[PDB]
């Protein structure tokens, strides 16, 4: 996260770290959506242009974390993966369309002060909140700058941007399964997700029921925090039918 700040303790208890077993290192962010399901970006697991194709046994999920590098004894919990599900129409070839994946844990994780699931949006909450200018929140342990790394989880609040402005900021073909967020050059404030924040959640707090909803997944961006560029996020609601199908079938 660029131009963010340290998270408060327990501020994002659905935040998950995807951790490579060997070498031991951060792979991506992710989010907890139930006691046995974790949501992330497909490109965290599968990206052939960079020779990336992780299998279940390659990875661990670390839940309840705050420090990036420390083993947070008595606080974090580490889970193994039973199965990875990548969206069948994830477009790694062109534009990261449908950049979404689910991971089923081998065993349910125990909830605690530090570990708790985020909600997924219904159609109405999505329609109400996914509006230009409305702010969401992104969290992660990724780079502090485009080209270093944080001691603890970082957080930044960013406004959703009008679709034509998103489109006009890039040569990539944008789809309805994406949205973009960030400040404009003339707005003064700044901030963005970055490398390593991949797969983490873009959340909004509903003013109707005071619950946090995951509206997006950190997907892509041209560098980080560049003037005139925006961060792109997988549109979770648009892909929720797939999420539900997977959980209903394999849950």
């Amino acid at each position: 996260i660029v131009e963010g700040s340290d998270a408060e303790i327990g501020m994002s208890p659905w935040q998950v770290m995807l951790f490579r077993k060997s070498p031991q290192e951060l792979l991506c962010g992710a989010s907890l959506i139930s006691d046995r399901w974790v949501l992330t970006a497909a490109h965290c697991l599968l990206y052939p242009p960079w020779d990336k194709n992780f299998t279940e046994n390659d990875l661990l999920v670390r839940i309840g974390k705050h420090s990036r590098t420390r083993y947070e004894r008595n606080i974090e919990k580490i889970s193994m993966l039973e199965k990875i599900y990548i969206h069948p129409r994830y477009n790694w070839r062109e534009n990261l369309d449908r950049d979404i994946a689910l991971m089923k844990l081998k065993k349910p994780v125990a909830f605690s002060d530090y570990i708790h699931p985020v909600c997924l949006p219904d159609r109405e909450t999505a329609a109400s909140l996914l509006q230009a200018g409305y702010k969401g929140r992104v969290t992660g342990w990724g780079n502090l700058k485009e080209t270093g790394q944080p001691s603890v989880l970082q957080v930044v609040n960013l406004p959703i941007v009008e679709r034509p402005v998103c489109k006009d900021s890039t040569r990539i073909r944008i789809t309805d399964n994406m949205f973009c967020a960030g400040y404009k050059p003339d707005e003064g404030k700044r901030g963005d997700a970055c490398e390593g924040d991949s797969g983490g959640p873009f959340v909004m707090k509903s003013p109707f029921n005071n619950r946090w909803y995951q509206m997006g997944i950190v997907s892509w961006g041209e560098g980080c925090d560049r003037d005139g560029k925006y961060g792109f996020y997988t549109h979770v609601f648009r892909l929720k039918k797939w999420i539900q199908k997977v959980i209903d079938q394999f849950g």
């Binding site: 303790i9 208890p13 605690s112 909600c119 409305y134 702010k135 969401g136 609040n157 003013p207």
Partner: peptide, 28 residues
């Protein structure tokens, strides 16, 4: 599920985090 999105150290105790109001204020 039923309890999703309510943080033990914040909503469950009626404590606000330092910047959540920034989100609310944008929901105009």
């Amino acid at each position: 599920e039923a309890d999703c999105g309510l943080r033990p150290l914040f909503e469950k105790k009626s404590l606000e985090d330092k910047t959540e109001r920034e989100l609310l204020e944008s929901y105009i």
